Design a protein around this ligand. Structure first.
Ligand SMILES: [Zn+2]
Length: 219
């Protein structure tokens, strides 16, 4: 079950009952970016926003209209435009933008409005009956990158720390820590022993093979 806007730049496909993956395309050459949309008994929760405030505002309206609920919280995985691009849209709509303190300060060094900076290395959030765990595995794609784990589904949102199956390029490594990236993916693997689905920053949902694939690219 996939829902798109009239343009094709935004789509939301269901992963399962209350877990959907939202994907937006940003021009530059159109690049897709993934994130999660969690349907809970107490509102919609998202993992990452979109490239900018226009797309982010449109993504929000799309999901709010569909589920007839308001987006209450959003988890920013790192301080790049594809995740925190619509930070200005979240704050004026009373949406809580959760992030580690580091992501918060890097958001300001990069010119984005500041997120909450509330997430610790390990933080467990529960929205209604939806359990979420955010984890900072260390430096990799960026200095502040975190992953999100849904224990009830064993679904991992590796985000930009994980590359999709056909990606042969690590992407932007100007702000990355290539050498540590590998140790950080290892911490994710050591922490979650029974991974089912793995959602990469860009690309189709895969499994733990995507983390092994990314470690291969890092070699
Ligand atoms: Zn990035």
């Amino acid at each position: 079950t996939v829902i798109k806007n009239e343009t094709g730049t935004i789509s939301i496909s269901q992963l399962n009952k209350n877990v959907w993956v939202h994907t937006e395309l940003g021009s530059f050459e159109a690049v897709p970016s993934n994130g999660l949309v969690l349907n809970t008994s107490k509102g919609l929760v998202l993992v990452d926003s979109s490239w900018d405030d226009k797309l982010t505002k449109e993504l929000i309206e799309m999901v709010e209209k569909k589920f007839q609920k308001r987006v209450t919280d959003v988890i920013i995985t790192h301080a790049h435009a594809d995740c925190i691009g619509g930070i200005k849209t979240l704050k004026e709509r009373g949406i809580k933008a959760h992030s580690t303190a580091l992501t918060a300060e890097l958001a300001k060094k990069n010119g984005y409005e500041e997120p909450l900076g509330d997430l610790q290395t390990v933080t467990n959030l529960k929205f209604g009956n939806m359990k979420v765990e955010t984890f900072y595995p260390g430096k990799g794609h960026t200095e502040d990158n975190i992953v999100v784990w849904l224990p009830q589904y064993n679904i991992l949102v590796g985000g930009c720390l994980v590359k999709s199956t056909s990606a042969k390029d690590l992407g932007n490594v100007a702000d990355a820590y290539v050498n540590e990236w590998s140790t950080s993916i290892e911490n994710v693997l050591k922490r979650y022993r029974n991974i089912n689905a793995v959602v990469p920053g860009h690309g189709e949902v895969g499994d733990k093979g995507l983390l092994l694939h990314t470690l291969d690219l890092l070699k």
